[PDB]
Design a protein around this ligand. Structure first.
Ligand SMILES: [Mg+2]
Ligand SMILES: [Mg+2]
Ligand SMILES: [Mg+2]
Ligand SMILES: [Mg+2]
Ligand SMILES: [Mg+2]
Ligand SMILES: [Mg+2]
Lengths: 294, 72, 169, 159
RNA sequence: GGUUGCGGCCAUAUCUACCAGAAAGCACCGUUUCCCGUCCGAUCAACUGUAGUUAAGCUGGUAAGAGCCUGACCGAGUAGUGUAGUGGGUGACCAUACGCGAAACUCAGGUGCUGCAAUCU
RNA sequence: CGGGGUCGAAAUGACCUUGACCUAUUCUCAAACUUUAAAUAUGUAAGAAGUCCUUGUUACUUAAUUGAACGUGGACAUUUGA
RNA sequence: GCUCAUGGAGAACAGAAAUCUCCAGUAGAACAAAAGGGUAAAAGCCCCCUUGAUUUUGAUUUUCAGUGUGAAUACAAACCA
RNA sequence: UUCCUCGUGGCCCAAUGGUCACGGCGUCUGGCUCGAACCAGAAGAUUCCAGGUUCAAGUCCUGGCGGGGAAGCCA
């Protein structure tokens, strides 16, 4: 009754594209990002796409074409266990490690890996990847955070920091990292270095084990199951950074199966369309029943 | 009515013809077509004009109206 | 079926629409401060009328928004005033409801004579889990009809809870 | 008084479209324009910067310059008894490649292929296009297609 | 073939009402010490992936469905129109000759296709 | 939940009258309305200043001998491009 | 960052219009003014920071004699937000 | 016909775009003394009509109506 739309409305209605309906893409931002200076004719503009789901971080290096965007390299958080991180796969430090991983990966496949080594001895400093003299002018890439809020302490900028320390030239200021004082507009490296390695998690683990233990049992459970203490958190991230810098070359999964074996069950399961003759018969039956004096 | 319109003609300028229409009243249908649609239940009177059944649309509504057509 | 389509209270909005600004509004704000533990928000006028005596952007009302167990606590404290009896008009077709009270000294705010006397317009917003699909930024969607709140659902909720009854119709 | 402004008489021309309002798809900005490319001009009304004058709507020109956001187009404009060359600095939203040149270059490479193919045996390619010739002789059968005789119909009112 | 991230064309993709949803994934979901933001940890931020649920979102299907798309010797070679005549007609206008050629209507059919990377009984 | 009468104490009460509003229909229209949309008029192109292959210059451009522009050298002639 | 006009359903004083909540809502609103175009995670509403409404001269489009003025466009070398 | 101006309580007249509108006369009530005059006090308005501009229109913008005024010349 009240929930009714007119044929005029639905005939005059112009749809948003598709990803605006799906609420996934700001085209006003994509315009500014992918649009290249027309005198750099086919020079591609490369986005570090950092996206956050529940239970996963996604980092991709993406260029644009008319038939669709194209990926150079991709790095997820569910493959960090290779390097030694099984817990906290969405935290600030896992974002840092994902950025470092995709940086070293794309540099390895491009040939910019022995030069532009990046920052090995982390210190919490604000420094951009500088160009070496008589050198290849490091790889340049711009953040695409998407519909995520630019906010101080947000963990998209942790991936940014990691990609910067890995050797990518990601243009950025330091006023969205943690440790940034608002009253005195400068940066504090100590809090940032603690965030890189999980001080904001280890401190909470300690302050919970000392105050409320049932919470420390329901969450931080896997740390107990696998013998990880608050102080054991810095070392595993420090070692994961080294393992990443050693072998970031994306060993994929074995897949356990083939595409056709995977598709057979889903096709068996998936509901299918109804033919035109079937539709006509389905309507004739309803005429003969509901209108044929039941 | 032919005489009433033949008298009206004098009030207008120009040439006006009087035509007997092959349709049923103010309808766009011929006489036998309207008759063979009213013998069945395609037709439904309104205050002055008439509504016709279509083979398009939802079937619940076309049975809520025009049941004489389906009661075959 | 019914795993997690339970009706929880999204929020409880307390509103006091004073026809004037100044000390009366400050005191009405100090009411809701002690009542909710939150800082209230004053709300402006949209346009002048010249009969009620309001200028545009003249700070005529004050309200506050409460969530969680505090909301149901204050709701119990107000239903005690209302004698656990509500009209059926007071329930909206979208599942939310509301009621007004006079003389907030019915609870909590005993007098503290520096404040005075004021009424409130309690309004209670009902929703089921999974309602941030409408509020979030990314992949914003609309809740399904089976999952929508309704008058017939929330009155049954309000009767099986608080063991209360509803008036005329 | 009279009125001859820049956007005079552009009401329906710089109208956007029916059910195609809003922003522009990204292919306009991902297309690539080099010097010498032939481009047609069709103004988008939602991008007020870099617009052409209404005279150049539906005009085809050649690119002479390329900048950050814009493209330099040469046009030929009839002014009295002669043509003058006109240089526009147009943003690319008002610009699309002409498909005529692509359809000509496909024919160019096809003719080259034919020439290389038939030079191996010398068979006089005759690569030029030709107009639609008159149709040749043929035979029409009445098997199952016997002529159906027709006649003019009388006059009826049909009202 | 399903799902996710990033997309291209931008309703064959939208809208209304129902139904169903292995696996994985997305999602809802749980908590507030820290960065951060709010009248409100509702939004935003951070932590956990642990306590639960496919209810919703999401995908698909259904509908003599609305809308949209395509086609047609459907209407209609109609209306309109370029050119021609010492053509008709008091005129208004209308026929004919050589050409071009619609829209509505009617009927029929369809209801997203696809690219890069990753992952899935 | 507009204005009237009747049963009426009134009622978030009823029977009727008239208006507005809603739904599906119906007749007729628009130089300064329009989904659609001609005919005639109009822009460009139909190759030697062209196409293709190879590799040279730059202080521009690129993550990069990657591109852009201009070039050397080589191949394709009178059906050389209606 | 948010979405408007308008309608509907509700909440003490509070009624046709005060403030609050929800649903629908392709723009039926607003964008200084005339009208016409254009615009929806904006070009609108609110908030933060600002002075690029800066310098140097040149080229182009419109009116057009391809003169001027006015207005506008896209660049260059700086300096800034 | 054109141009200018005005339209306000029963009458005459005024107003800063900024309280459902100043004054005076008339009317009504009471008083003084029978009535006037006089002393106190009250009531009375959809600012000609129809539209718009602004948070706000008596006023600000357009058209109509009615009242008044000026012009309507060379031949
Ligand atoms: Mg943004
Ligand atoms: Mg157009
Ligand atoms: Mg042509
Ligand atoms: Mg914005
Ligand atoms: Mg000039
Ligand atoms: Mg008296």
């Amino acid at each position: 009754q009240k929930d009714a739309k007119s044929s005029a409305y639905s005939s005059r209605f112009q749809t948003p594209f598709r990803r605006r309906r799906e609420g996934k893409t700001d085209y006003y931002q994509r315009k500014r990002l992918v649009t290249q200076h027309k005198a750099k004719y086919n020079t591609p503009k490369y986005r570090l796409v950092v996206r956050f789901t529940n239970k996963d971080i996604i980092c991709q290096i993406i260029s644009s074409t008319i038939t669709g965007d194209v990926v150079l390299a991709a790095a997820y958080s569910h493959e960090l266990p290779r390097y030694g991180i099984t817990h906290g796969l969405t935290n600030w430090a896992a974002a840092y490690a994902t950025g470092l991983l995709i940086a070293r990966r794309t540099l390895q496949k491009l040939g910019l890996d022995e030069t532009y080594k990046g920052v090995e001895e982390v210190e919490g400093e604000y420094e951009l990847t500088e160009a070496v003299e008589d050198g290849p002018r490091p790889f340049k890439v711009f953040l695409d955070i998407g519909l995520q809020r630019t906010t101080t302490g947000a963990r998209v900028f942790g991936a940014l920091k990691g990609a910067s320390d890995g050797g990518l030239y990601v243009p950025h200021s330091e006023n969205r990292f943690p440790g940034w004082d608002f009253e005195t507009e400068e940066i504090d490296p100590e809090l940032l270095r603690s965030y890189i390695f999980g001080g904001h998690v280890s401190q909470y683990m300690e302050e919970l084990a000392d105050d409320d233990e049932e919470r420390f049992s329901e969450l931080f459970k896997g740390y107990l199951a696998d013998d990880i203490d608050a102080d054991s958190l810095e070392d595993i991230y420090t070692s994961a950074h080294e393992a990443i810098r050693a072998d970031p070359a994306f060993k994929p999964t074995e897949k356990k199966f083939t595409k056709e074996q995977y598709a057979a069950e889903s096709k068996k399961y998936r509901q299918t369309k109804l033919s035109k003759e079937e539709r006509a018969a389905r309507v004739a039956a309803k005429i003969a029943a509901l209108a044929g004096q039941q | 009515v032919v005489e009433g319109l033949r008298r009206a003609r004098y009030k207008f300028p120009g040439q006006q013809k009087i035509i007997l229409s092959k349709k049923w009243g103010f309808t766009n249908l011929d006489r036998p077509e309207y008759l063979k649609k009213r013998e069945a239940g395609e037709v439904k009177d309104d205050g002055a004009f008439v509504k016709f059944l279509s083979k398009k649309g939802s079937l619940e509504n076309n049975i809520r109206e025009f049941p004489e057509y389906f009661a075959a | 079926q019914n795993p997690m389509r339970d009706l929880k209270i999204e929020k409880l909005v307390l509103n006091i629409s004073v026809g004037e600004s100044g000390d009366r509004l400050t005191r009405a704000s100090k009411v809701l401060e002690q009542l909710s533990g939150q800082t209230p928000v004053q709300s402006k006028a949209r346009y002048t009328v010249r009969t009620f005596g309001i200028r545009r952007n003249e700070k005529i009302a004050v309200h506050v928004t409460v969530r969680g167990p505090k909301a149901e606590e204050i709701l119990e404290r107000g239903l005690k005033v209302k004698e656990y009896q509500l009209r059926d008009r007071n329930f909206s077709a979208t599942g939310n409801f509301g009621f007004g009270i006079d003389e907030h000294i019915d609870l909590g705010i005993k007098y503290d004579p520096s404040i005075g006397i004021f009424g409130m317009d309690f309004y209670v917003v009902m929703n089921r889990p999974g309602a941030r699909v409408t509020r979030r930024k990314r992949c914003k969607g609309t809740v399904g009809n089976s999952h929508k709140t309704t008058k017939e659902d929330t009155v049954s909720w309000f009767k099986q809870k608080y063991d209360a009854d509803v008036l005329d119709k | 008084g009279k009125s001859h402004g820049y956007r005079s008489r552009t009401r329906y021309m710089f109208q956007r479209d029916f059910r195609k309002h809003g922003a522009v798809h990204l292919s306009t900005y991902l297309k690539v324009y080099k010097v010498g490319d032939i481009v047609d001009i069709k103004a988008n009304g939602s991008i007020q910067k870099g617009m052409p004058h209404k005279f150049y709507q539906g005009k085809t020109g050649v690119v002479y310059n390329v900048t950050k956001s814009s493209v330099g187009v040469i046009i030929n404009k009839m002014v009295g008894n002669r043509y003058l060359e006109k240089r526009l600095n147009l943003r690319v939203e008002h610009i699309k490649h002409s498909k005529c040149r692509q359809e000509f270059l496909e024919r160019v490479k096809a003719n080259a292929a034919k020439r290389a193919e038939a030079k191996a045996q010398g068979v006089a390619v005759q690569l030029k296009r030709q107009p639609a010739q008159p149709r040749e002789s043929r035979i029409v059968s009445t098997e199952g297609n016997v002529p159906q005789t027709l006649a003019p119909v009388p006059y009826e009112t049909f009202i």
